[PDB]
């Protein structure tokens, strides 16, 4: 809660300035994000075979159609046809990956835990992701949602005092670190920053970060990815050459990583959402429901990605199945309507994420552009130097 209670007219003009479909109402402290799970009917937690098999076999068919189309004209295709096939395959794999992320939290087919764990491992493998490290990081996210200095497995924002500290530690903005930060948080490569998250899994490939009674499970978790990049990745190259690798593997990879990064970045970032450190005003239900955003999709994309944008219906109910995530949302707006936040697909939203909302300041408790912030903390350096000439 940052731009909390004031007339709804200015929050609506803010929502139109930012492309947001709504801005939340006031939320009082002392609540549990599991509370509002008592509202949903006792049939929203139901199990059925047809919906799940559709959710797994539809993006599969998308990917298969894209591959068949490509292998039909393997490398004689032009550039934008290649881009179309890459986007289609990456979207199908994002859907399959959401099925994976479902069976990782044990809420896909609880009837067969072994079969569902094997399915999650198999479907995470082609993206080079270990199932148990993913599960640990996602629970560690849920526990610290929107907490400062604590949720590093989400989109932890870069704050002001730390950037001034690095400014002094590098001796100006001309070092490698400052230039890297600028170039990564200013250009559309930010929309692919999830790649860096993939390099923060494999926690140094170090079992000293885990609980001993889990070692044999963590290593097997690092096995299915490695084995893949040890067996299949060669074969492809062997049978396709360098170009034949940049086509059938790397581009769908960048597509899936784009989808992942933008989903998360738009789900938990907004100027009307503050990032408090706990002790200095944090709360579970507040930073859960009030500091969140839900995005809108075309129903084709929603049946492809398998409800990949409904993150709150399963943050109030961690055991809510996947084919019921829209329906549950239907109930939630009926109850917490004024406090919800919503948004849609718009290149304007992404452009504001790229150019406007770049640095988080805790004084105004909101996001600011990076060049203005950098010139102004250079001005504060001028200030402290003026206090230092004598």
């Amino acid at each position: 809660t940052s731009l909390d209670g004031l007339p709804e007219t200015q929050k609506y003009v803010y929502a139109d300035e930012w492309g947001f479909s709504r801005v939340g109402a006031d939320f009082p402290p002392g609540s549990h994000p599991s509370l509002f799970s008592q509202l949903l009917p006792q049939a929203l937690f139901a199990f059925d075979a047809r919906a799940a098999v559709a959710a797994v076999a539809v993006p599969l068919a998308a990917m298969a159609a894209g591959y068949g189309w490509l292998w039909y004209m393997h490398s004689i295709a032009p550039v934008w046809q290649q881009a179309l096939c890459a986007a289609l395959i990456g979207t199908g794999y994002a859907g399959l990956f959401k099925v994976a992320h479902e069976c990782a939290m044990m809420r896909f087919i609880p009837q067969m835990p072994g079969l569902q764990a094997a399915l999650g491992t198999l479907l995470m493998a082609p993206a080079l992701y270990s199932l148990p490290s993913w599960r640990l990081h996602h629970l560690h996210h849920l526990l610290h949602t929107n907490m400062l200095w604590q949720d590093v497995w989400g989109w932890h924002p870069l704050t002001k005092v730390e950037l001034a500290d690095e400014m002094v530690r590098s001796g100006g903005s001309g070092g490698a670190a400052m230039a890297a930060a600028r170039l990564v948080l200013t250009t559309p490569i930010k929309l692919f920053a999830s790649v860096g998250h993939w390099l923060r899994s494999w926690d140094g490939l170090d079992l000293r970060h885990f609980h001993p009674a889990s070692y044999v499970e963590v290593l097997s978790g690092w096995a299915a990815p490695l084995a893949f990049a040890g067996l299949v990745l060669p074969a492809v190259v062997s049978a396709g050459g360098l170009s034949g690798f940049v086509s059938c593997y790397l581009a769908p990879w960048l597509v899936f990583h784009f989808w992942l990064s933008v989903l998360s970045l738009t789900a938990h970032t907004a100027p009307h959402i503050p990032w408090r450190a706990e002790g200095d005003g944090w709360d579970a239900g507040r930073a859960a429901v009030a500091g969140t955003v839900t995005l809108r999709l075309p129903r084709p994309l929603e049946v492809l990605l398998n409800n990949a944008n409904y993150m709150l219906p399963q943050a109030v109910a961690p055991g809510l199945p996947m084919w019921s995530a829209p329906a549950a949302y239907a109930v939630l707006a009926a109850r917490l309507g004024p406090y919800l936040t919503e948004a849609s697909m718009s290149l304007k939203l992404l452009t504001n994420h790229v150019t406007r909302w770049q640095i988080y300041d805790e004084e105004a408790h909101t996001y600011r552009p990076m060049e203005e912030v950098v010139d102004e903390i250079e001005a504060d350096l001028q200030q402290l130097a003026a206090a230092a000439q004598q």
Partner: peptide
């Protein structure tokens, strides 16, 4: 180091009831 000892401990206690 030992940065997931506690979370895994509690998760094991609760999911294996």
């Amino acid at each position: 180091f030992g940065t997931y000892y506690f979370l895994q401990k509690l998760l094991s206690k609760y999911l294996d009831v």
